[PDB]
């Protein structure tokens, strides 16, 4: 007879740690990188010169 870990089990709490717990990281880059145009409607037209004499 010896009062093993399974006889004492109800006295033995596991602990918890946040050391490896993180949110998602914001990896997106195109809005930070390229110039942004604020659109007032679904479609916008951009005229460009195509040819010259």
């Amino acid at each position: 007879a010896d009062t093993n870990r399974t006889d004492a089990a109800a006295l033995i709490q596991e602990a918890y740690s946040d050391v490896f717990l993180d949110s998602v990281s914001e990896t997106a880059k195109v809005i930070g990188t390229f110039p942004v145009y604020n659109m007032g409607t679904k479609t916008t037209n951009l005229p460009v010169l195509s040819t010259f004499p």
Partner: protein, 54 residues
Amino acid sequence: HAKWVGESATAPEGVKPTAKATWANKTLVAEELAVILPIHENVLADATEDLLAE
């Protein structure tokens, strides 16, 4: 529990017994109970009593 003991250096009645204590676990588990009371907006307007308070 304790036991009565002899004094022998060699006979089995001179030896003190070993023994265990032991623990067990009870648990609270939270369980939910609920109801939904649907009522029609016109009935709630035409009644003389506040049926939402009731």
